[PDB]
Amino acid sequence: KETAAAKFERQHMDSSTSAASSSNYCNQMMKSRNLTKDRCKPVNTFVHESLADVQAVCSQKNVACKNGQTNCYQSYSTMSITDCRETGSSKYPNCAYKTTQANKHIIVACEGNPYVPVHADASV
């Protein structure tokens, strides 16, 4: 089994690129990060910042999570991110995604020791 921290890293970290400069970015990333196995993950965000920068959010602005829990944090600064969302033409195993690059504040849920991100709770 994958640890919560490791899963967050695989699903949401992409520090190798400063931004998604192609419409095929999501199709490639969703496939390579294994998010289209057995089924197409409907929505998923990738953050283009260092892992250290994202982990640091766990000690930044404490905010409520969508579910009401209180272990969520909002990044003080905006970050380069790419949102991936299935398109109408998407049909597993032939998943299709729209790539939307943007700069926004990320919101993550943190847990453990070390206290690190374990869930992506949107972005502002």
From Swiss-Prot:
Entry's Gene Ontology BP terms: defense response to Gram-positive bacterium
Domain of life: Eukaryota
Cellular compartment(s): Secreted
EC main group: lyase
Gene Ontology MF: a single term: nucleic acid binding
Entry EC number(s): 4.6.1.18
Residues reported to bind substrate: K7, R10, K41, P42, V43, N44, T45, K66, R85
Keyword ATP-binding: no
Catalytic activity: an [RNA] containing cytidine + H2O = an [RNA]-3'-cytidine-3'-phosphate + a 5'-hydroxy-ribonucleotide-3'-[RNA]; an [RNA] containing uridine + H2O = an [RNA]-3'-uridine-3'-phosphate + a 5'-hydroxy-ribonucleotide-3'-[RNA]
Effect of H119A: Loss of activity
Tissues with expression: Pancreas.
Coiled-coil ranges from the UniProt annotation: none
Keyword annotations from UniProtKB, A to Z: Disulfide bond, Endonuclease, Glycation, Glycoprotein, Hydrolase, Lyase, Nuclease, Secreted, Signal
Disulfide-bond pairs as recorded: C26-C84, C40-C95, C58-C110, C65-C72
Role according to the record: Endonuclease that catalyzes the cleavage of RNA on the 3' side of pyrimidine nucleotides. Acts on single-stranded and double-stranded RNA.
Assembly with partners or alone: Interacts with and forms tight 1:1 complexes with RNH1. Dimerization of two such complexes may occur. Interaction with RNH1 inhibits this protein. Monomer.
Family note: Belongs to the pancreatic ribonuclease family.
Protein name as catalogued: Ribonuclease pancreatic
Organism in which the protein naturally occurs: Bos taurus (Bovine)
Segment of the intact protein contained: 27 to 150 of 150
